[PDB]
């Protein structure tokens, strides 16, 4: 299984945070409303990942490791650290009903990586 395509394996339509802890450690917005973000799969690396995209500019760009973990901040709110970007990404939600669909798939995809590499080197 390699070389699929060019098109994303899952996408929704969240809000975007981004941590600033180079000011204040804290919570904090980067895009002033929801924005929709995109999955992809790296056959080179065997691995997900998690691309989005707002305006002319790329903020998300995080790779979905077995090492991760997902960590909820509200009952319709989810984020995610990144050891690669060395930051915290978190989308907001306006339901549970739908960070429950993003966090279970989440962690379907780093099971999916975890066998992949497991088997490969």
Known sequence: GSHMGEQP???????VFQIDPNTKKNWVPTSKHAVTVSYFYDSTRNVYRIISLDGSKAIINSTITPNMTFTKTSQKFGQWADSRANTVYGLGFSSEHHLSKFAE???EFKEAARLAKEKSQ
């Open 105 to 107: 798939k989440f962690q």
């Open 9 to 15: 394996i899952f996408s929704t339509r969240a809000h």
